[PDB]
Amino acid sequence: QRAKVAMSHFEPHEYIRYDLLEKNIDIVRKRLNRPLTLSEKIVYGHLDDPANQEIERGKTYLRLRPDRVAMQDATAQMAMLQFISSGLPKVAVPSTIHCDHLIEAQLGGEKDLRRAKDINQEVYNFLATAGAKYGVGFWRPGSGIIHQIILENYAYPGVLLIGTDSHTPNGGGLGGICIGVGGADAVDVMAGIPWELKCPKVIGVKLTGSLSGWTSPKDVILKVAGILTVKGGTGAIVEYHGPGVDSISCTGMATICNMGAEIGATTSVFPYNHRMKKYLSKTGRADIANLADEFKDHLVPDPGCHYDQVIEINLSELKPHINGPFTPDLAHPVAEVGSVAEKEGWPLDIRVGLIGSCTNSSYEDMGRSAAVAKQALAHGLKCKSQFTITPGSEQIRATIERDGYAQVLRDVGGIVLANACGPCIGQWDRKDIKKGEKNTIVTSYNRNFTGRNDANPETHAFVTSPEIVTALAIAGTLKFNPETDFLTGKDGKKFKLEAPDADELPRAEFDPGQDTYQHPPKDSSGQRVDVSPTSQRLQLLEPFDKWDGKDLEDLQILIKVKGKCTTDHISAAGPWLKFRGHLDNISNNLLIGAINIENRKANSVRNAVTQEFGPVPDTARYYKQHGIRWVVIGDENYGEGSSREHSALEPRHLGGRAIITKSFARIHETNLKKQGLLPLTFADPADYNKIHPVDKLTIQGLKDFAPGKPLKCIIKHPNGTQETILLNHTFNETQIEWFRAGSALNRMKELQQK
Ligand SMILES: O=C(O)CC(CC(=O)O)C(=O)O
Ligand code: SF4
């Protein structure tokens, strides 16, 4: 470039390329002859061949070059084990590993971490030395949660970042296009080969007005989530625009983008503006803010760019919301959730109140919660509900501890957890309830699908802002309304809660903390990575079978799934995180949470030759060692949720060939294709009704598998009738080669020596 500004402090030699962004935007701009949205500018500004790339929203697969890769320790293991199989020497773009997903909440900060490190020394150590070996930066356990370390250190306007986590859109709060992927997408960028992405549509949400009172940034995506729903954002990027943008802070902007993962959006982004400039300078990146100020026409939407749908939200009419209890999109004003709870049969007294995580743990957030705590304490009140605080990073723990917020929150009775996901992915030894107990918990997180936080199917979880969680945790009931209601203080007087006031960023600078990162040594030409051969924690990958050149006749249906089938139903979290680097060990959780349309139950499918009902994993393995290839049949938005590539490897390992659904979620469908399976959707969703557990399917036409050509499937019913349906797919000729080779990885390897 002519400028020479580093990407971050951890890669001083790797410089931001806005000259390249601008050359490619301008190449593109002139083929297209129209105004581009901001996400078109950053996405198309990162094409590997802008002159030849065919660009059609919701139609072409864009071939991109991401700037940096970020991995999280529950998905970095499989990501690094597949990278280890590419055979490549070192990674090709800046990459980092963050250790946040294997630390369980039990006693508090310090104690839960010493136990995580003892318990997990094998995995942490594989990650650290594979880091030292292949050049990936390593954030040491307890250092923070990946989306917070990224926003505070690695995100900047104009970055195209990919992370092995669904909540990676968090970065859009700093004007970057940060998309979540499975580990095999991460090894493509890391291997140096172009990454593909189906050209997104752009939903535009225009923000008008200013935020007030109890209303936070969190509210804007709770309202939008309710407006679009879980199915609403699939295939698009939500771009936020309007006067109202400058009324939100950078970390508030990151809250909104972060929760956009729950409506199925490819990512979410906000335009470079002064709030982001400010945060850049307060997080030690004044120079990124200054460089960006000179490339500002490339970091805002063009005038009159076109959104395929526009949603208009008035921040000034907006008022506090609590979403749930079993999806992020049943939206409620905080004002009404009391009544709905009693009309509906929802536990009214709030059991545990949880604030924090990477969605709501900025200094601003911690401060507004403390500004509510400070008033209850000022009337000798304390938390009527159990209360936990999770800092998203060591830097946020260190700075809020120092500016006093952390003690305020201990004084109303909160317990500060380790700077790790903890109860947000379900990594929580909860004890106040009995299992099966019916109870209500309120968090400031994002996802509140079933059993996500404690695996108690009957726990009713609502998500809202940290300030409303504190206010409702002192109250101990969903019946309470902060805005309106009075509290009886220790002294017998009533008073009400003042809407919090708080500094957006520290008056002072931010305390980084001690000893959070391990640099890769460009030194250790002799760094060695060893997976002990008999480890129950880690296992080297073994190449999947290449395709047989034949059609898939007489496939047995392992399970026909009724309803919602999220990646937590396919590959559960909680206790299976322990085996996230061991494929034949986590495979014993294949589809145990899914509902079998035959008997309305989970984990009891009927074995075809023994005619006895039992676990799905077992039955699949049965089929496998008997030579039975099988298929999974699903309903809408299959593979919905978390990025877990183990939802695609695990059917591949137990002998699955195809998953035929009415619709797939984005990240799950890339992962099926990457692992050599067939993701197929019905060309008519009414055909899901022609297929029964007992039918055998033949998928025909693999021989002349073509982009756009649909596949013909013959349904063979027990009485000798058969039916023929058509099945569509989104395989381009790049993905058909992954199919052929048996996985994308087997293909990757054919491009060297075969
Ligand atoms: O149906 C598809 O082709 C994929 C989906 C999600 C995506 O990859 O963006 C879509 O195009 O809507
Ligand atoms: S599990 Fe929760 S805290 Fe962790 S990265 Fe995901 S949204 Fe953030």
PDB file of N, CA and C and ligand atoms in Angstrom, residues 58-59 61 197-201 234-236 264 266 664-667 669-670 729-730, ligand 1:
ATOM      1  N   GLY A  58     -28.050 -13.955  -4.387  1.00  0.00           N
ATOM      2  CA  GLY A  58     -28.760 -15.200  -4.093  1.00  0.00           C
ATOM      3  C   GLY A  58     -28.602 -16.269  -5.154  1.00  0.00           C
ATOM      4  N   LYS A  59     -27.722 -16.010  -6.119  1.00  0.00           N
ATOM      5  CA  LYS A  59     -27.443 -16.838  -7.273  1.00  0.00           C
ATOM      6  C   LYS A  59     -25.956 -17.200  -7.486  1.00  0.00           C
ATOM      7  N   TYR A  61     -21.750 -18.246  -6.703  1.00  0.00           N
ATOM      8  CA  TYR A  61     -20.877 -18.465  -5.545  1.00  0.00           C
ATOM      9  C   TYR A  61     -19.648 -17.596  -5.722  1.00  0.00           C
ATOM     10  N   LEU A 197     -18.711 -18.273  -1.194  1.00  0.00           N
ATOM     11  CA  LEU A 197     -19.877 -17.830  -0.468  1.00  0.00           C
ATOM     12  C   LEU A 197     -20.949 -17.504  -1.496  1.00  0.00           C
ATOM     13  N   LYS A 198     -22.145 -18.081  -1.393  1.00  0.00           N
ATOM     14  CA  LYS A 198     -23.325 -17.790  -2.212  1.00  0.00           C
ATOM     15  C   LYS A 198     -23.570 -16.310  -2.071  1.00  0.00           C
ATOM     16  N   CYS A 199     -23.688 -15.605  -3.183  1.00  0.00           N
ATOM     17  CA  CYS A 199     -23.834 -14.172  -3.156  1.00  0.00           C
ATOM     18  C   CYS A 199     -25.047 -13.864  -2.292  1.00  0.00           C
ATOM     19  N   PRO A 200     -24.880 -13.101  -1.200  1.00  0.00           N
ATOM     20  CA  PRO A 200     -25.969 -12.647  -0.331  1.00  0.00           C
ATOM     21  C   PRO A 200     -26.941 -11.613  -0.876  1.00  0.00           C
ATOM     22  N   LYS A 201     -28.159 -11.667  -0.381  1.00  0.00           N
ATOM     23  CA  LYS A 201     -29.122 -10.619  -0.578  1.00  0.00           C
ATOM     24  C   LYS A 201     -28.807  -9.648   0.542  1.00  0.00           C
ATOM     25  N   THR A 234     -32.245 -15.938   6.431  1.00  0.00           N
ATOM     26  CA  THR A 234     -31.448 -16.896   5.653  1.00  0.00           C
ATOM     27  C   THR A 234     -31.089 -16.319   4.303  1.00  0.00           C
ATOM     28  N   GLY A 235     -29.829 -16.500   3.929  1.00  0.00           N
ATOM     29  CA  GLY A 235     -29.291 -16.108   2.641  1.00  0.00           C
ATOM     30  C   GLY A 235     -28.971 -14.652   2.469  1.00  0.00           C
ATOM     31  N   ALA A 236     -29.137 -13.810   3.482  1.00  0.00           N
ATOM     32  CA  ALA A 236     -28.902 -12.377   3.384  1.00  0.00           C
ATOM     33  C   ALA A 236     -27.970 -11.828   4.440  1.00  0.00           C
ATOM     34  N   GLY A 264     -30.806 -16.250  11.183  1.00  0.00           N
ATOM     35  CA  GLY A 264     -30.246 -16.972  10.066  1.00  0.00           C
ATOM     36  C   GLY A 264     -29.564 -16.164   8.988  1.00  0.00           C
ATOM     37  N   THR A 266     -26.418 -14.299   6.966  1.00  0.00           N
ATOM     38  CA  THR A 266     -25.032 -14.706   6.739  1.00  0.00           C
ATOM     39  C   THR A 266     -24.090 -13.920   7.660  1.00  0.00           C
ATOM     40  N   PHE A 664     -32.297 -26.101   4.234  1.00  0.00           N
ATOM     41  CA  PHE A 664     -31.162 -26.190   5.144  1.00  0.00           C
ATOM     42  C   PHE A 664     -30.739 -24.825   5.611  1.00  0.00           C
ATOM     43  N   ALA A 665     -30.019 -24.833   6.721  1.00  0.00           N
ATOM     44  CA  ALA A 665     -29.408 -23.632   7.211  1.00  0.00           C
ATOM     45  C   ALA A 665     -28.058 -23.662   6.515  1.00  0.00           C
ATOM     46  N   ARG A 666     -27.590 -22.457   6.223  1.00  0.00           N
ATOM     47  CA  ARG A 666     -26.372 -22.156   5.475  1.00  0.00           C
ATOM     48  C   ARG A 666     -25.132 -22.892   5.912  1.00  0.00           C
ATOM     49  N   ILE A 667     -24.627 -22.698   7.148  1.00  0.00           N
ATOM     50  CA  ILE A 667     -23.353 -23.254   7.592  1.00  0.00           C
ATOM     51  C   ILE A 667     -23.485 -24.742   7.623  1.00  0.00           C
ATOM     52  N   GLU A 669     -25.255 -26.749   5.596  1.00  0.00           N
ATOM     53  CA  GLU A 669     -25.181 -27.243   4.244  1.00  0.00           C
ATOM     54  C   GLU A 669     -23.770 -27.091   3.700  1.00  0.00           C
ATOM     55  N   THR A 670     -22.949 -26.105   3.996  1.00  0.00           N
ATOM     56  CA  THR A 670     -21.578 -26.120   3.495  1.00  0.00           C
ATOM     57  C   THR A 670     -20.786 -27.276   4.089  1.00  0.00           C
ATOM     58  N   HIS A 729     -30.365 -29.251  -5.379  1.00  0.00           N
ATOM     59  CA  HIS A 729     -29.116 -29.150  -4.684  1.00  0.00           C
ATOM     60  C   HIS A 729     -28.497 -27.792  -5.056  1.00  0.00           C
ATOM     61  N   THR A 730     -27.438 -27.285  -4.374  1.00  0.00           N
ATOM     62  CA  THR A 730     -26.765 -26.048  -4.768  1.00  0.00           C
ATOM     63  C   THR A 730     -25.292 -26.242  -5.099  1.00  0.00           C
TER      64      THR A 730
HETATM   65  O1  LIG B   1     -30.959 -22.012  -0.889  1.00  0.00           O
HETATM   66  C1  LIG B   1     -29.737 -21.730  -1.062  1.00  0.00           C
HETATM   67  O2  LIG B   1     -29.191 -21.825  -2.173  1.00  0.00           O
HETATM   68  C2  LIG B   1     -28.829 -21.235   0.076  1.00  0.00           C
HETATM   69  C3  LIG B   1     -29.446 -20.125   1.017  1.00  0.00           C
HETATM   70  C4  LIG B   1     -28.424 -19.670   2.116  1.00  0.00           C
HETATM   71  C5  LIG B   1     -27.088 -19.083   1.630  1.00  0.00           C
HETATM   72  O3  LIG B   1     -26.103 -19.807   1.389  1.00  0.00           O
HETATM   73  O4  LIG B   1     -27.002 -17.867   1.509  1.00  0.00           O
HETATM   74  C6  LIG B   1     -29.927 -18.877   0.174  1.00  0.00           C
HETATM   75  O5  LIG B   1     -29.399 -18.583  -0.938  1.00  0.00           O
HETATM   76  O6  LIG B   1     -30.908 -18.223   0.609  1.00  0.00           O
END
